[model samples]
Target: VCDKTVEVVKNAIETADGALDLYNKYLDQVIPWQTFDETIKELSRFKQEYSQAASVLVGDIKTLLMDSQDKYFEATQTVYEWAGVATQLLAAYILLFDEYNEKKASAQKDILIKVLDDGITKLNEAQKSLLVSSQSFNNASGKLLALDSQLTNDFSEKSSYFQSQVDKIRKEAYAGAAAGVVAGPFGLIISYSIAAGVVEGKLIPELKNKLKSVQNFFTTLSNTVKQANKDIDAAKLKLTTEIAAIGEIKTETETTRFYCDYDDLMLSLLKEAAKKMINTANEYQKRHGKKT
Candidate 1:
């Protein structure tokens, strides 16, 4: 059963790679917009608090693994939990904060950019936490996959559904957010238009178009997760839903930094899944031996 998770983890990593360009396209065309100074302040605060929240939550997960090193069987329980919590914080961030968009203002066109410099900057900060959340999730699963053969040696609680559960967690970004529980710093105002508005040009759509694009983005992302979820549910981990969650905004070449895909705006699940897959090899071993 849990062996299915090994495949699921592999699928998630690859599946995430598939979405990179699309996600990058989304970010490239994205922007940060808000209703007023209060939102700007509100958003910045969110970055600070939520990141701290994620750190605390993720830290707790690590401690559990560290303490449980001797118990590999139970240690795996932590894998699912680790992936779940990481995604949850990211999902919660996507869900809770995006709802904050729930906005005003007399600011003119360009006025927004300058006035929003720091506020927009904060969005990146929020993204970094997302990076942490996503990376953590990936690490958890990646390690599980890595230690699969080792763990499989003593595998118990069999009937395996670990990776599928992960896909379920990944699906949360869209599923959770789609539940109307999701929101952006300005989900309503915090959409492609706002993002497009920030980047400007043909990217920026008119009102309806703006909303439409966002729906399109969400819908597209949702379908991706659903399909992938569909796969995982079938134990067909190879399916695209492997990285279902609309969480974690992927990072790019380290040298460039800021903008140009370094960190635009997006909380992604796919990329993290991808990373988790890549980094997974040792984290599980870390549980017993510490590999980093």
Candidate 2:
């Protein structure tokens, strides 16, 4: 009687799947989607050369003048880990095949299995999504926590929350779905309910409820990932701008003599190399890092 259950189940599946797709769409727009390999190498080289450049300054204040950009490397490395893992998570959540078996049902088969199978796929996908994020954040942040402690901790906190939620989702939902499939059950429902019995009573309502819940879970996760993408991109934008400029600009009096500082060189001895590095950084960012 309740043929409508099948359509409702399909609609619910689309909603859940849409949420997962939205998460990746946000990820695909992240800045510095490319690794900062060349920038890191150049920055490391400049760190050594930085001291050498300051040596030419004869004043005792020379030590005070030049800047060591430890945080610059820290910033670059922090964003690197985030974006790389973002990419990783994007791929990790992918469902391998159409487990839902959307094709038309031909001959006699287990009707409940056909319905529960999609529910199983939904649970497994959500489970993997949370687990992948949790494990990657745990590992990636452990190594990079010193650079940006609070931000990486945010990463850990949110991801661990997802993991916890998924565990509960599986525990409860899987049980509910499995309970529906016991033999002589729909067997229980079908043989007994011919006219008005199976429609609202046994067959469909539960499936719709479960599938809708699954859709909300996916929708929530998709937006969660999207929110992080915004925050991450906002953080990266200014850093890229500063790196492109080789540091914030300061005006010095004609004879006041200032040494190289931040991302820029005060001494002409360092200016040429610093400028070259700046150009390279700008070039890389222009082509690779997505615009805000």
Candidate 3:
């Protein structure tokens, strides 16, 4: 799977290189360096091409993931969860093209450098967004993949304690072979207190804390999802109003630190995915009580 992922990313980057070369050529021949105006339109064609290519490339890889199931191990039962992360990353890239439209409306733009600056800022934010979300997604994926290791660790920890208890009971039973009912086969120290203690001493408090934590975290996650959707809609609305300003801004560079190619965004997505997958895997290990 890892090798396949690397191949997909490599192809995406290679395709991006071709698009980037043309972008550079277009910028060199077309963008005005000194003049600025709100009427200026720029990179509209590039946005369309990028959006289309990114969609196709990401979609293909997603199709590849449909076969990620393992019939034997069944450890990756939640493989689709990783797909959800990738889908969001692709969605974010698709949204970037619209951001291009948003910038186009601000003025009959001038100062080629400032156009570059604005592009840089917006693109960087997109990059950051992809990275942050990717980290989370990867963490979740990793957790799902390490179930066996987790189970082994859990069983090992309980082994000696259970074995010692069984040994002690057997010895007591042997000592009272014929008087079992009267002797009650000892070592039942504080047995009745255990269930009650777990209920009153551990269960209630721990359950309350866990429930509260779950509620708080779920609320935060829910709000973040809502805000992301809202921002995308708001951006689209602003683009709608500034429709006339579309393709107006120009810069010397074909792409900015933030606003270059959709593949650049995809690169960000992969990095985010890698981080998220690993973190999620580690979290799962911890949840399963793995020793290290």
Best by TM-score: 2
User: Residue-wise lDDT of candidate 2 within 71-169, one digit each (tens)?
Assistant: 223333333333333232222222211131223122101222222233233333333433343333233323232323322332242454333433443
The TM-score that candidate 3 achieves is 0.21
Residue-level lDDT tens digits of model 1 in 240-292: 23232212212111111111121222224423543443343233334334434
Q: lDDT of each structure? A: 0.30, 0.30, 0.32
Number of clashes found in candidate 1 = 19
Per-candidate TM-scores read 0.20, 0.23, 0.21
Q: On a 0 to 1 TM-score scale, where does candidate 1 land against the true structure?
A: 0.20
lDDT of 3 by residue, 1-292 (tens): 2344334433332322222222223321232212212111221212222223333432332222221211101221222232233234333433444546435312212222232243334333333443333333333234323322332332232444333433443455445433332111111222322223323453223323433443343244334333433443343244333321212222212222332234555556645543443444344334334354
**Model 1 misplacement above 4 A:** 1-111, 114-116, 155-292
The residue ranges of model 3 lying beyond 4 angstroms of the native Cα positions read 1-195, 198-202, 247-292
Quote the RMSD, in angstroms, for model 3: 24.6
- Candidate 3, after superposition: displacement of residue 22 in Å? 25
